[PDB]
Ligand binder design. Structure first.
Ligand SMILES: *[C@@H]1O[C@H](CO)[C@@H](O[C@@H]2O[C@H](CO)[C@@H](O[C@@H]3O[C@H](CO)[C@@H](O)[C@H](O)[C@@H]3O)[C@H](O)[C@H]2NC(C)=O)[C@H](O)[C@H]1NC(C)=O
Ligand SMILES: *[C@@H]1O[C@H](CO)[C@@H](O[C@@H]2O[C@H](CO)[C@@H](O[C@@H]3O[C@H](CO)[C@@H](O)[C@H](O)[C@@H]3O)[C@H](O)[C@H]2NC(C)=O)[C@H](O)[C@H]1NC(C)=O
Ligand SMILES: *[C@@H]1O[C@H](CO)[C@@H](O[C@@H]2O[C@H](CO)[C@@H](O)[C@H](O)[C@H]2NC(C)=O)[C@H](O)[C@H]1NC(C)=O
Ligand SMILES: *[C@@H]1O[C@H](CO)[C@@H](O)[C@H](O)[C@H]1NC(C)=O
Ligand SMILES: *[C@@H]1O[C@H](CO)[C@@H](O)[C@H](O)[C@H]1NC(C)=O
Ligand SMILES: *[C@@H]1O[C@H](CO)[C@@H](O)[C@H](O)[C@H]1NC(C)=O
Ligand SMILES: *[C@@H]1O[C@H](CO)[C@@H](O)[C@H](O)[C@H]1NC(C)=O
Ligand SMILES: *[C@@H]1O[C@H](CO)[C@@H](O)[C@H](O)[C@H]1NC(C)=O
Ligand SMILES: [Zn+2]
Lengths: 184, 596
């Protein structure tokens, strides 16, 4: 089954444009990823893995995130913050597993990895499993807006990952395996 | 649709832009500091120019939001930091003139040298050179020659520049809705808003006067003892009741009195504590010193160093291959990057400097969670005080005996304690009047009570009345004596040191009381005392988000500056001085002058 293309790729997607990777039509063998990829984060809020043999998945979804260090705690049910409210929101009844791992050796650069973006401003809150690609400028004042300049601001901002950052600022490749058990 | 929401969004954008820009600038600066190479200078210049341009561009857009329509007391501080017109209130030509005058003053101070008479081919700089003469000479004529020379060559090339500097700075200060530039600096201690913790800009002067009115007896006794002891080295140059000449204080300006220990030691037969031989005999390195400092810091419950600090921070001099600047400094590059830059040697002085720098790093690491604009100390005095409390606490004989660097059978006597107390006093107590007088003179000059033609007539007049030092030769209005200092020729404040010195002993007393210590304060170690660390943490993580009065009250228990702990720390020395000088005279008269 394809897990090699899902976990061992050169490039992933930004959190604002997170890839809802489709996994289907194969046999679940991710125990090698236990040893090949030492997942430091592994939180399962749904059923126990030991029950996974009773019910399998066909139309299961997977998510690929590239986010900061002091943010994996924000990817949890009932949590709040910038990313949870504007970028990716999980439902309260979330049955899935969050997995994260450090990616200094392949997602950091001396000049700066200016290829991963994240939403900052939006005139609303998000709902579970919603994706936004809009690039229209954000309004902050009463006057109508055409272009940047005054209070109006662009809605997207990029990261500045470097290999010599601290533990809380180094990029974490975060597979939020929000694999939906109810839908498959 | 309101103003508060728009201000919140504006600060949100600025917070994310400034982090990246500042990190780039700091990394470039560190890379320059490691080497000495042209391309590093080019990169540093480019990064600094970009950061300054971004800050200037962002400053203009922040004035659109009125300060009176926002009631949050947290975003208001950040906006007040940002809404400040720096030097753009005046016209472009005036700003160019101010930048030129500052650069000229700095260049004149930096590259000043004096040549011995009739020997044009032999000229000495300030460092090395005149400093060695000031710190390690027992002669009389040479010290006076150097003291008069340095000022004669430097100050007259700075006074006319300083007049225009003062005029333009006053113009800018009045354009910024202030009273003068002295009020501009006093505004750092200003607190407005929440009731019960207000601190007007004018309260600082009264507080400093009241606090200094209590230190006078101890300083009087110390001055009398020093004057009595120095009559043995300069038998025919010191008045029995007069003031001490300023050229015999072991320093160019008299800021510290440390270099007089070899002349005023009470018991010269009994040696002091020096563990250098113990350091050598056990094959100690810089890594061992740093790990011992880390062990000391963790003994009180504080966190320890990040892994990256052990990799990106250099500890020893690379050698002739590279060329670095050996100067201890704690670097906070942001985004979780903390480094230490110091060339370490096996010596007790480095053993204490490591503790000072690691305290710096701990304080910097404490407030990493606050927003970018609030990532600093409560005021300009907390930082070095937090650094120095550890250095004072780590030099106790009990700690040295506990770590095995001293012989367990060394019977500590009540005679070495006097020596240690005197050595500490000569460098702590003897600098407060100098700082206080310099700041008072600067404030009086900026305010306007002293006309342009009556500057020096006050400058030497205050000395005789406060510090007890007299000029060896007369001076006229052409000289500019204060500008000879680094902090006066270059635009720098000077009231930091007085507040830091008063805060450090108060914090030490609070921690020692919280540590269940029995005995004199000078024999206090905060090691193995969790209660002595957690309390300090309550101040470490606040940062600038709260008024400094509340931060001070959270540890000591009082919301105002106090001096009683400082005098309590020196009680046995005070008693010994009182007993010793019963046959001498305390006090000085402002009539005796060496030149008349
Ligand atoms: C002045 O503005 C600051 C923010 O600029 C306000 O501080 C903020 O206060 C809110 C509460 O109203 C904090 O929200 C937090 O939300 C989480 C969500 O789970 C909740 O668990 C917390 O208990 C808390 O309510 C927010 O973190 C905090 N932010 C900061 C930077 O302090 C402050 O309240 C304003 N002043 C007044 C008087 O309202
Ligand atoms: C220093 O900061 C102050 C604000 O704290 C800036 O003052 C503002 O300056 C602008 C331009 O001079 C003023 O706009 C003009 O106001 C007049 C009178 O209301 C109006 O007739 C013009 O059409 C124009 O709008 C603005 O009112 C003024 N605001 C305040 C509160 O003083 C000042 O420009 C800054 N100085 C710099 C950046 O050099
Ligand atoms: C702080 O506490 C530690 C732990 O008690 C002290 O280290 C001990 O010192 C005694 C000296 O008699 C040794 O017998 C123990 O073996 C040491 N502990 C360990 C774990 O080795 C330390 O000396 C104390 N520091 C101060 C300054 O009192
Ligand atoms: C992952 O990719 C690396 C580099 O191509 C390769 O050496 C390694 O064997 C791969 N492991 C997996 C998951 O197949
Ligand atoms: C998502 O991942 C799938 C499977 O690797 C890939 O085929 C597809 O191109 C990706 N899409 C995006 C938007 O990255
Ligand atoms: C420092 O200088 C050496 C040689 O002078 C060079 O090899 C090295 O790359 C330089 N490093 C930095 C950070 O400038
Ligand atoms: C102190 O440093 C040691 C050495 O790595 C570490 O094991 C310990 O966790 C540190 N203490 C704290 C409170 O971080
Ligand atoms: C130390 O104690 C002795 C006790 O015999 C006493 O005579 C002496 O005055 C004390 N002080 C000094 C400085 O020796
Ligand atoms: Zn320091």
């Amino acid at each position: 089954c394809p897990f090699h293309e899902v976990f061992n790729a050169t490039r992933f997607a930004s959190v604002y444009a997170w890839n809802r990777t489709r996994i289907s039509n194969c046999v679940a063998d991710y125990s090698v990823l236990y040893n090949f990829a030492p997942f430091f984060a592994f939180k399962c809020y749904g059923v126990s893995p030991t029950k996974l043999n009773d019910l399998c998945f066909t139309n299961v979804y997977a998510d690929s995130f590239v986010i900061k260090g002091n943010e994996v705690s924000q990817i949890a049910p009932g949590q709040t913050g910038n990313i949870a409210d504007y970028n990716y929101k999980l439902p309260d009844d979330f049955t899935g597993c969050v997995i994260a791992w450090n990616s200094n050796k392949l997602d950091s650069k001396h000049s700066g990895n200016y290829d991963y973006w994240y939403r900052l401003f939006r005139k609303s809150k998000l709902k579970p499993f919603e994706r936004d690609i809009s690039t229209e400028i954000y309004q902050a004042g009463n006057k109508p807006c055409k272009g940047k300049g005054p209070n109006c601001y662009f809605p997207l901002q990029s990261y500045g990952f470097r290999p010599t950052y601290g533990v809380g600022h180094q990029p974490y490749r975060v597979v939020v395996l929000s694999f939906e058990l109810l839908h498959a | 649709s309101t103003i508060e929401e728009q201000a919140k969004t504006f600060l949100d954008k600025f917070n994310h832009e400034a982090e990246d820009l500042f990190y780039q600038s700091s990394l470039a600066s560190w890379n320059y500091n490691t080497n000495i190479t042209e391309e590093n200078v080019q990169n540093m210049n480019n990064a600094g120019d970009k950061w300054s341009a971004f800050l200037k561009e962002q400053s203009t857009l922040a004035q659109m939001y009125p300060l009176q329509e926002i009631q949050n007391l947290t975003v208001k501080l950040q906006l007040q930091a940002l809404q400040q017109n720096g030097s753009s209130v005046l016209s472009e030509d005036k700003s160019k003139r101010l930048n030129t005058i500052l650069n000229t003053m700095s260049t004149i101070y930096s590259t000043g040298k004096v040549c011995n008479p009739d020997n044009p081919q032999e000229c000495l700089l300030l460092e090395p050179g005149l400093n060695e003469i000031m710190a390690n000479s027992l002669d009389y004529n040479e010290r006076l020659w150097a003291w008069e020379s340095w000022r004669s060559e430097v100050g007259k090339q700075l006074r006319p520049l300083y007049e225009e500097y003062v005029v333009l700075k006053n113009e800018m200060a009045r354009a910024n809705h202030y009273e003068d530039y002295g009020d501009y600096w006093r505004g750092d201690y200003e607190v407005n808003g929440v009731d019960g913790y207000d601190y007007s800009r004018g309260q600082l002067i009264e507080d400093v006067e009241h606090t200094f009115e209590e230190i006078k007896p101890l300083y009087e006794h110390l001055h009398a003892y020093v004057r009595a002891k120095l009559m043995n080295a300069y038998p025919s140059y010191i008045s029995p009741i007069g003031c001490l000449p300023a050229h015999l204080l072991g320093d160019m300006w008299g800021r510290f009195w440390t270099n007089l220990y070899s002349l005023t030691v009470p018991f010269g037969q009994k040696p002091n504590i020096d563990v250098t031989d113990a350091m050598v005999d056990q094959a100690w390195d810089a890594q061992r010193i740093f790990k011992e400092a880390e062990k000391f810091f963790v003994s009180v419950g504080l966190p320890n160093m990040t892994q990256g600090f052990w990799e990106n921070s250099m500890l020893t001099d690379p050698g002739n291959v590279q060329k670095a600047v050996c100067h201890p400094t704690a670097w906070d590059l942001g985004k979780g990057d903390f480094r230490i830059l110091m060339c370490t040697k096996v010596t007790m002085d480095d053993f204490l400097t490591a503790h000072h720098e690691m305290g710096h790093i701990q304080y910097d690491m404490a407030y990493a969670a606050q927003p970018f604009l609030l990532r600093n100390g409560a005021n300009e005095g907390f930082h070095e005080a937090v650094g120095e409390i550890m250095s004072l606490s780590a030099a106790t004989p009990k700690h040295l005996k506990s770590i095995g660097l001293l012989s367990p059978d060394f019977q500590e006597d009540n005679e070495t304690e006097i020596n240690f107390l005197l050595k500490q006093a000569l460098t702590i107590v003897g600098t407060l009047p100098f700082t206080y007088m310099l700041e008072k003179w600067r404030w009086m000059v900026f305010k306007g009570e002293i006309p342009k033609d009556q500057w020096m007539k006050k400058w030497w007049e205050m000395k005789r009345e406060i510090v007890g030092v007299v000029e060896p030769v007369p001076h006229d209005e052409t000289y500019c004596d204060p500008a000879s200092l680094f902090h006066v020729s270059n635009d720098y404040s000077f009231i930091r040191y007085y507040t830091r010195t008063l805060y450090q002993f108060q914090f030490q007393e609070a921690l020692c009381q919280a540590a269940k210590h029995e005995g004199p304060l000078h024999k206090c170690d905060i090691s193995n005392s969790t209660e002595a660390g957690q309390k300090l943490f309550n101040m470490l993580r606040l940062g600038k988000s709260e008024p400094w009065t509340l931060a001070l009250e959270n540890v000591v228990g009082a919301k105002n500056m106090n001096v009683r702990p400082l005098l309590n720390y020196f009680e046995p020395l005070f008693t010994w001085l009182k007993d010793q000088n019963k046959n001498s005279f305390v006090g000085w008269s402002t009539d005796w002058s060496p030149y008349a």
